[PDB]
Amino acid sequence: EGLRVVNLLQERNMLPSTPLKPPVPNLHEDIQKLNCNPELFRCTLTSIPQTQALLNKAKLPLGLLLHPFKDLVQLPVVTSSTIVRCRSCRTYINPFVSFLDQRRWKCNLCYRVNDVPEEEPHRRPEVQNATIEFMAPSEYMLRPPQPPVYLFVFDVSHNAVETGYLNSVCQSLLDNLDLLPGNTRTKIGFITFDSTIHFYGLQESLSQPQMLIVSDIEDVFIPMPENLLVNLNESKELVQDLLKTLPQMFTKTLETQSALGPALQAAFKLMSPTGGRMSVFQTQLPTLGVGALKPREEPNHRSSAKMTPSTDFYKKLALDCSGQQVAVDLFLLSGQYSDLASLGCISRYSAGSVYYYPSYHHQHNPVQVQKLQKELQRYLTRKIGFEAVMRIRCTKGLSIHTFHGNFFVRSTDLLSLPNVNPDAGYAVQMSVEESLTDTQLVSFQSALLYTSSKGERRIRVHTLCLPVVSTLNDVFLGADVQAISGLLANMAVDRSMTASLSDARDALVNAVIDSLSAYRSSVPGLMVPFSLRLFPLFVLALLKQKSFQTGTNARLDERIFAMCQVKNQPLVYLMLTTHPSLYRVDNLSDEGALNISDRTIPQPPILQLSVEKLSRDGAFLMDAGSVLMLWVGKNCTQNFLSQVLGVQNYASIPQPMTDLPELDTPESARIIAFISWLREQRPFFPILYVIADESPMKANFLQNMIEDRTESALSYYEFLLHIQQQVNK
Amino acid sequence: MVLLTMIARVADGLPLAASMQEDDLQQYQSQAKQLFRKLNEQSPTRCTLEAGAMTFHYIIEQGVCYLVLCEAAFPKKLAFAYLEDLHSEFDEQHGKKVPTVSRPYSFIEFDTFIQKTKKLYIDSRIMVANIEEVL
Amino acid sequence: TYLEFIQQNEERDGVRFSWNVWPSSRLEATRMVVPVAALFTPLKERPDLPPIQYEPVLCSRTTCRAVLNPLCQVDYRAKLWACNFCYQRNQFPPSYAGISELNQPAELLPQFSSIEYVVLRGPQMPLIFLYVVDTCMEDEDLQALKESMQMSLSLLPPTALVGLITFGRMVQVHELGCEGISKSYVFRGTKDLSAKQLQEMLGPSNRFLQPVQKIDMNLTDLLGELQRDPWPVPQGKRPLRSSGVALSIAVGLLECTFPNTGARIMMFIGGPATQGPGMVVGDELKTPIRSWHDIDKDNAKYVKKGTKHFEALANRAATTGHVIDIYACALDQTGLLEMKCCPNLTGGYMVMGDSFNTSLFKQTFQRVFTKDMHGQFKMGFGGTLEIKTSREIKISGAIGPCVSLNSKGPCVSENEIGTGGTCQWKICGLSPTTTLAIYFEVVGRGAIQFVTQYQHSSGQRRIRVTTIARNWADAQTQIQNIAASFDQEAAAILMARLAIYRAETEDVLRWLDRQLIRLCQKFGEYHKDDPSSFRFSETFSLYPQFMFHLRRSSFLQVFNNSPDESSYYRHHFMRQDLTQSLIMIQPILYAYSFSGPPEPVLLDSSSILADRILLMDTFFQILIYHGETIAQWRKSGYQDMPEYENFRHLLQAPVDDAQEILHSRFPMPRYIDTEHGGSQARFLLSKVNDVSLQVFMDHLKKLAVSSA
Ligand SMILES: [Zn+2]
Secondary structure, X not given: OOOOEEEHHHHOOOOOOOOOOOOOOOOXXXXXXXXXXXXXXEEOEOOEEOOHHHHHHHOOOOEEEEOOOOOOOOOOEEOOOOOOEOOOOOOEOOOOOEEOOOOEEEOXXXXXXXXXXXXXXXXXXXXXXXXXXXEOOHHHOOOOOOOOEEEEEEEOOHHHHHHOHHHHXXXXXXXOOOOOOOOOOOEEEEEEEOOOEEEEEOOOOOOXXXXXXXXXXXXXXXXXXXXXXXXXXXXHHHHHHHHHHHHHOOOOXXXXXXXXXXXXXXXXXXXXXXXXXXXXXXXXXXXXXXOOOOOXXXXXXXOOOOOOOOOOHHHHHHHHHXXXXXXXXXXXXXXXOOOHHHHOHXXXXXXXXXXXXXXXXXXXXXXXXXXXXHHHHHHHHOOOEEEEEEEEEEOOOEEEEEEEOOOEEOHHHOEEEEEEOOOOOEEEEEEEOOOOOOOOEEEEEEEEEEEOOOOOEEEEEEEEEEEEEOOHHHHHHOEOHHHHHHHHHHHHHHHHHHOOHHHHHHHHHXXXXXXXXXXXXXXXXXXXEHHHOOHHHHHHHHHHOOOOOOOOOOOHHHHHHHHHHHHHOOHHHHHHHHOOEEEEOOOOOOOOEOOOOOOOEOOOOOEOOOHHHOOOOOEEEEEOOOEEEEEEOOOOOHHHHHXXXXXXXXXXXXXXXXXXXXXXXXXXXXXXHHHHHHHOOOOOOOEEEOOOOOOOOOHHHHHHOOOOOEOOEOOHHHHXXXXXXXXXX | OOOOEEEEEOOOOEEEEEEOOOOOHHHHHHHHHHHHHHOOOOOOOEEEEEEOOEEEEEXXXXXXXXXXXXXXXXXXXXXXXXXXXXXHHHHHHHOOOHHHOOOOOOOHHHHHHHHHHHOOOOOOOOOEEEHHHHO | OHHHHHHXXXXXXXXXXXXXXXXXXXXXXXXXXXXXEEEEOOOOOOOOOOOEOOOOOEOOOOOOOOEOOOOOEEEOOOOEEEOOOOOOEEEOOHHHOOOOOOOOOHHHOXXXXXXXXXXXXXXXXXXXXXXXXXXXXXXXXXXXXXXXXHHHHOOOOOOOEEEEEEEOOEEEEEEOOOOOOEEEEEEEOOOOXXXXXXXXXXXXXXXXXXXHHHHHHHHHHHHHHOOOOOOOOOOOEOOOOOXXXXXXXXXXXXXXXXXXXXXXXXXXXXXXXXOXXXXXXXXXXXXXXXXXXXXXXXXXXXXXXXXXXXXXXXXXXXXXXXXXEEEEEOOOOOOHHHHOHHHHHOOOOEEEEOOOOOHHHHHHHHHOOOEOOOOOEXXXXXXXXXXXXXXXXXXXXXXXXXXXXXXXXXXXXXXXOOEOOOOEEEEEEEOOOOOXXXXXXXXXXXXXXXXXXXXEOOOOEEEEEEEEEEXXXXXXXXXXXXXXXXOHHHHHHHHHHHHHHHHOOOOHHXXXXXXXXXXXXXXXXXXXXXXXXXXXXXXXXXXXXHHHHHHHOOOOOOOOOOHHHHHHHHHHHOOOOHHHHHHHHOOEXXXXXOOOOOEEEOOOHHHOOOOOEEEEEOOOEEEEEEOHHHHHHHHHXXXXXXXXXXXXXXXXXXXXXXXXXXXXXXXXXXXEEEEOOOHHHHHHHHHOOOOOHHHHHHHHHHHHOOOO
16 A cells, blocks of 8 residues: 655556555545445545645645446335425435434434434434435326337448448347347337438338338428338238348449438437337438538648537537437448537537447458447447436535536536436536535435336436545545546546647646646645546556547547547546557466456466557557457467467468357467456457458557657657656756 | 326326426416316216317226327327327236326336327327316 | 301311311401311221321421322323322432332321321330329228229339339339339428429339339229328328429329320329429318319419429420320319319320329229220320411411420411411320311311321321312302301301410400300391391301300300319310210200100200109219109109019110210210109209390390490
8 A cells, every 4th residue: 555655757657456446535434435436436536625725735636436337246126105305496305314313323324303204213224325326206207218219220321331330230120120128018119311311210010011102302291191200010021021121222322422411310209209219220421401511631640730520410400419318329330521529519519429440341441340349339229318418416615617518408407417327427526615524424416317228217216425534645645546547537528629730738737747746836756646646657657548649640530539438438448448458468377366266367467558568479458448459469378379370371361350269278278268357347248359460551559558658759768758857948 | 289297197187107208397287287177976977178379188997097298280090099009008008007106206107108109190101178167 | 057167177187177168268267257277186986097108208398398198290101199288299208119000008088188107217215104192192092092003013014114213202213123222212292392402302114104014003003002102190180292393293203204205194192282383272270272263363372383393394295295194083172273284285184083092093094095996095195286287378377285396387377376476386195086176367179187196005106187178169159058057066166265265374254155146147047126027047046046055165165164074174175075075055855755766855954844854964973863743753652663664765765875874975974864853853954945045046136136
């Protein structure tokens, strides 16, 4: 542990060999054992500053990062006939209240005393679990629970037909039709579009589906009152037939324009009466009708930081979908510029999310083909909640002032979530509106009201409790370096859209400068507290990431999609992306976790992201969260080539290698176990490709060695040198 | 001559099954839940209420209330024939589980039969009071 | 015999003039009570004339260019001929260099005065059939209609192109044969579209119009799977039916794909248009469809705006050269009054029944596709009529299924009648019974040449040429020769065509009577102010009777009929030959009794005997009436007894005679079996009998012998 002080100039090896654990709030033993899991709910400062003045002096951002709908191992479900809430601020009774009269409880957020209803009260499950799910009563619904409604909207233009994406998507829908969340009330629908809009009717009385073409692009309408959204249970056979015919109907298409705007307007009209989830697959710039977007020239390594949408059509449309409980998920499989900076608004403000597959092609791009396959598997089978809202409460004195993530902020800070999905993350920024001189603990409560895929109104509640400190040092001792990096990234993305990429990159650098300068003016080299010894490293990693990098050759839609991930992803996968984990894997052995039964999993140490840590003699696995890259050195041992890769020499390693073979060797068993254990830590199955040789030109592997200098960015050492010059200026 | 169907347990007004399609709903859905609250063991078991351009119809069987709303011009004869079709089906399927449930809409899946039955009445091919009184 | 002359000239030339001897002076031309006019049947069938396969041969005076004909003076020595219209002398074309006296071309023999040429120079275009189907109707009616359309698909030529348009609330244009999916383009029936717009929204054959031999199996299965308009019909409402937009899309589709070629737009409606442009009535069931009484008291807010929409469509189709048929079967009115211009301007059919699920409609619909002795349809497309006259004759206009090409020349008269101001007309669709009325004006031997270019059902381009000539009246006896040439039947129909045309484009009876009284004074015989002295010759004696029945007919007394029934009767009367036209004006009546074979009897109450069977042919209706005695004898059961096989011959004698005419007639007449006291005997009682003919004649004689 330690309250020690570190000189970043003399260490340079501060990154530990074992995974980073989130800090433990400085709380009494019995309080901390009840606290919310940090994977679900965590704060940038585990010790809340008592006043806004103290928060300002530390020059660190105060905020929460939440993963509210995350898949859980075990979830207590109270079905109580009554839900116990505070009569003033409607806070749910939670483990951190104060029982006094044993029939009266004091709210930990508004301090009002309440009456425990005749319904050992501190033994009740609502007071033993920081995370709990309630059944909602009749008053908590505006309407009967909506059924699950899935509408798939496919681009079928000539460019789309060429990518061949339709074949895999229709195959995944076929394989996963019985796994779609829902009961017998589930409805499914299909729309394709090119210059016109194509609905599909499904009837057991008709020999085949029927394609209904709306050609009036300026005045779309629903051509049929029934059978466009059909009951999946009743019409399973008709849906399966359609999915087999769709990839073959447009082989010889000469349509080259795409009317994405009008298609979404018709898709909205079709979903308006029920709500649900709308999956949109688009492969090019929208060029026809409302929502047309102008072409643009991609930047190169030479242009400086000189982002925002080009129209508000998709934001307005997304706002209308939010009002009807419709969420739009965007799958952009484009080979050229598509103005994602404007298309992304359809998902940001409707609580959807965007998935990007640059230069998808069924024959030319095997990596993107397998990536879409695996991401669609998760998309179609994960749990889902409909027509949802979220409220976030904190103790009197603390005020949320900025929200980050995919939703719509209604009045009085109701977060509107047409869909809630278990892979979405959110962030919130707060300030101390009133001095916390009164209390010594503060609490945070998020509550998610949603409709399950079974038709049951449920409320998921998480409650977090933290202590209040009154000195600069205690603020620094509780700092969570990763959560600070996450919130800063969300803030820099907003700064980019609001100002420029230069301003966002400056404010990121100045966050390190001002914080360490504040620390220095309150104690030669660059002295940081132990809890911030990775702060310049992660911030430098932020500045070389695809969201904020400068002198690189990055294309517009790449940068936008990297920002959309910052806004939407949970903290963990933002850390795995910004600062991938680097292990040596040609020499695994038996210091592992041999604990999980018959498996022995090696546990190689984490290396720092420098080419100095590589070796032409070995092999190195890089865990980047969504993908795993296995780099083989040119001078790699013959044991690793034959016993792990299945190849007699470096030259016969196939160019795209989409995975490792499973050979009958112990070295093979070790690396397969280590890789197995890595992807079991997550639901989004990450693809491994071993192709990163030194010659396949796929070694963007090196774009992640964030400690090394490049022609357009500093090294980690240069960075520390620049911080120090600014700190004691 | 359109729609709003709700099936509720008379005692506490617990909703059991409903079905509504728009493409307002908020005012008449409230009035419906008012009715369920007021109705008790002394209430008329077959009734029609007048809400201006709209008209409520309901029957009460085995402590369960079957309510429908439509424009005042919709044939009152058909509104009650539609409720009997639902009651016989619903009582046959869940009539004995009704008095035990405690969640709202514990029978959402009765949605399906409601709408296949509903379409056999909104296609041409007892007491009377003013709802504002009862409320 | 003047009768043999009239009869033989209709058989050979398919024409019948009101006067066969024409006024030779300006003083008689202006003073003609009934105008010189011709009932002309451009495609009349006859005993197998040889179709002549060569270019016709024409007068070379650019203004003239008449066709070589038997009235032309030829010189087989000098290889010359003299145009009988402009006196221009012409050299014989190379392929005629070998013609001789013994052997001469067909067009010069008087036998071939009406003759047909086949012009084979370009590839032939396929026929085009576009079905436009309503889906807002009962299941039994829609099922019957689907089977009728499938049956007609198996009679079309292999090379013809077919399309399908269905409608209700929306309009669907089906793209045939797509395989694995059936697709169509959907449009709101709430707003209209132009051909240009429609062409851009949709993108020899098309994707929407495909050859039968490639598409027929898919079309049969599509037509078999057609279902009711999926939109529900609320209580007390009519279904939303967008007939006007569906028709404007069918027209627009063909207009931007195959303009200026033969095409048939066959529309099947099962009710009135209740939405869009062309609307006929609102969707409230409580509001009845308009009646003539509603029309006259200005309680029909849809007639004029709806009529305007379909007239625009009719002219669009007729300009393009396409044909619109309206097949309308329903228990209520359907909007024929507003849509009549589409099959009237074009040569389109108009069929009207109570349901598509009757023998009446099913048999009528298949007569449409009657073939000749070569397996080829008895229809023609893109007909162009051009009339050339002597310098003394001018054309006032035409009345019939035709549109003007607005071509000017010295033959065009200033006094225009009907579709006038032209010597060229277009007739998008014609059959062997299509009869035009051409009205002439004089400003021996006058001559007129009828030239009809049209596309045969086989694809061949054809020219039919009829050339007739009538004597100029000898100046010594101008009115005596003229009065001997009067065709009273032809003139009655020709004057009747003039009266219906003025009523349907608004008192008309006052014009009919002044002309009748005037015809009495000029050509009758009488002492002044002695009504009993009036007599007509055999040449004029039936004209008053034809005029009595015409002025009481449902062609002119529109009340007691629905507006759609008035337009249906008038539709078929403006197209028919003379024989059928007379039957419409004056139904023919046959008597059946033990006392002698079947005999014609007067259309008077005095022919209704109690022991007699009457069979009345109304053209529209075949009616059998069993008198009171025969009704009882037949209510008794005497027919079954072997004793009374004579009472069976009697009861089945009119039934047998009905079956024969109940086939030949294209609009299959409704068949009625009734008796004394029966409800349907009303039809016999209203056609029978001012109050009567005797009173009508006496009043006419009083005015004939009095002031001019
Ligand atoms: Zn409270």
